[PDB]
Design a protein around this ligand. Structure first.
Ligand SMILES: [Zn+2]
Ligand SMILES: [Zn+2]
Lengths: 370, 94, 73
């Protein structure tokens, strides 16, 4: 209402004037379905410039770090009405910013309904459940016979709201959630998406097995690029369209100016022989007219494909990719290390995104394109 | 020749101690946190925040752990071992 | 009845008859009546979550009873 005769009742239902002269208010204030004890003594007159405000220790614990805001509102604020308005909204904010202290689930619906749906599913799918029953992780199999996991994080009310679904595979899963839909519904959506992608998975697993995956190491299921090794100290990375995997990916070659050219030229002339009925490897073989090494490892266990500047493999994800256009050096480098070096030198001139300089080891012209 | 009131748990206090939260042998460790226990199983925890307003602010929890707590101790790396007449349980603050 | 394993929890030991041998504690049976069982995991998988569910809801129960008494007052 307009007058604080009724508006006070309407907006603080549980504040009981104790004295005849409305001077001791006591009882509860509401917040996020939670009542908190409060005795708010005023002077003989209606002044908040001077008022007492005492609490339950629960209450003070929650309004730790606003004691000043409280004092300021008491002294600046017109009436009690808006005092309680502001205080209440402030309690709302305190709690939401401490959101991590909440979520008693309703057991008569939760723990039972969840077990019933786990029964409906079957106990070969599930892989993980938290002691608080917040986090779950489930398995399904491909027709290929691959384990694909799916984490769900469920709320105090699972059926009410959508369970947040976290999944490895690359393209985004969309789940048409109704409160009528369930774990089985979303599992079926997951199976649908799975069986949709299977082709892409078949391609990725076929490359991981029959080729030397280089840049990704035990790659996860979201990864669509594949830095493959081929010949020696030349790589090709491939990023694949998840919907059209068999379709031509985005492709390129790292390595020697003299090595990389004939690959580019061969790619240009043959690309029409590419055919999306075959596998990516079976198409690469006929387009690039070569076969791949399968992890040429033990022979050359200290041959130093490493930076030759920092002398290390694996600089902060980065790999020795930039090489010398020379038969006698072939000394690989890092982008990072060769830029940092060549920047210093007198001889080094920078065009737009390129630096020409001398190879550290052999002092021959080497080009770096950032 | 003065006495100061901190919190008032509603139930009897049993154990008061201190922990090293965020532990990132030496007998004096510079203890980061403060712990109190109730009997009825109210736990209290306090820590320094120094966040949001650019001032040190006292960060209070109050957990309500199960069962009538009969005893407790603190162990290496922000761990508290406590006992209910059912089972011996633990809390990790790290 | 005692803890023969050194696990913490008490176990029951049952000795079968002296017809088997003229020897003590041959033909034994040690059991917790849970997981531990000696003699002469979709089951054991989702149980601690369920236990913790009881604990959470027991805490809420008792909390609200305290809360009720407060309102009476
Ligand atoms: Zn380097
Ligand atoms: Zn060189």
């Amino acid at each position: 209402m307009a007058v604080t005769e009724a508006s006070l009742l309407r907006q603080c239902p549980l504040l009981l004037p104790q004295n005849r002269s409305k001077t001791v208010y006591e009882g509860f204030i509401s917040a996020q379905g939670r009542d908190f004890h409060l005795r708010i003594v005023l002077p003989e007159d209606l002044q908040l410039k001077n008022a007492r405000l005492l609490c339950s220790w629960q209450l003070r614990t929650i309004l730790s770090g606003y004691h000043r805001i409280v004092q300021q509102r008491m002294q600046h604020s017109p009436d009690l009405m808006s005092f309680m308005m502001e205080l209440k909204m402030l309690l709302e904010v305190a709690l939401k910013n401490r959101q991590e202290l909440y979520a008693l689930p309703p057991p008569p619906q939760f723990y039972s309904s969840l077990i019933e749906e786990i029964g409906t599913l079957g106990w070969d799918k599930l892989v993980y459940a938290d002691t608080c029953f917040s986090t779950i992780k489930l398995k399904a199999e491909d027709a290929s016979g691959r384990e694909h996991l799916i984490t769900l994080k469920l709320k105090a009310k699972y059926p009410a709201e959508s369970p947040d679904y976290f999944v490895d595979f690359p393209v985004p899963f969309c789940a048409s959630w109704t409160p009528q839909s369930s774990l089985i519904s979303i599992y079926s959506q997951f199976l649908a998406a799975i069986e949709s992608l299977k082709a892409f998975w078949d391609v990725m697993d076929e490359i991981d097995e029959k080729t030397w995956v280089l840049e990704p190491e035990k790659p996860p299921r979201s990864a669509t690029a594949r830095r493959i090794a081929l010949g020696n100290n030349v790589s090709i990375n491939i990023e694949v369209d998840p919907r059209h995997p068999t379709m031509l990916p985005e492709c390129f070659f790292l390595g020697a100016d003299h090595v990389v050219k004939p690959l580019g030229i061969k790619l240009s002339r043959n690309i029409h022989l590419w055919d999306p009925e075959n596998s990516v490897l079976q198409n690469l073989k006929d387009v690039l007219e070569i076969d791949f090494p399968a992890r040429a490892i033990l022979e050359k266990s200290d041959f130093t494909m490493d930076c030759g500047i920092c002398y290390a493999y694996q600089l902060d994800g980065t790999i020795p990719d930039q090489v010398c256009d020379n038969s006698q050096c072939g000394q690989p480098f890092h982008q990072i290390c060769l830029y940092e070096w060549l920047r210093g030198l007198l001889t080094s001139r920078q065009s737009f995104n390129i630096i020409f300089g001398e190879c550290p080891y052999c002092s021959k012209p080497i080009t770096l394109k950032m | 020749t003065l006495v100061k009131i901190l919190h008032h748990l509603e139930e009897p206090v049993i154990f008061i101690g201190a922990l090293k939260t965020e532990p990132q042998p030496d007998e004096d460790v510079h203890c980061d946190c403060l712990v109190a226990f109730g009997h009825h199983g109210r736990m209290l925890a306090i820590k320094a925040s120094w966040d949001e307003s650019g001032k040190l602010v006292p960060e209070l929890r109050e957990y309500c752990l199960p069962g009538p707590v009969l005893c407790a101790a603190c162990g290496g790396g922000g761990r508290v071992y406590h006992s209910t007449p059912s089972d011996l349980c633990v809390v990790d603050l790290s | 009845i005692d803890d023969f394993i050194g696990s913490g929890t008490e176990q029951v030991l049952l000795l079968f008859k002296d017809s088997l041998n003229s020897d003590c504690l041959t033909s034994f049976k040690i059991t917790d009546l849970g997981k531990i069982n000696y003699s002469s995991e979709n089951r054991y998988l989702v149980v601690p979550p369920l236990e913790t569910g009881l604990k959470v809801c027991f805490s809420s129960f008792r909390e609200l009873r305290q809360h009720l008494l407060l309102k009476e007052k």
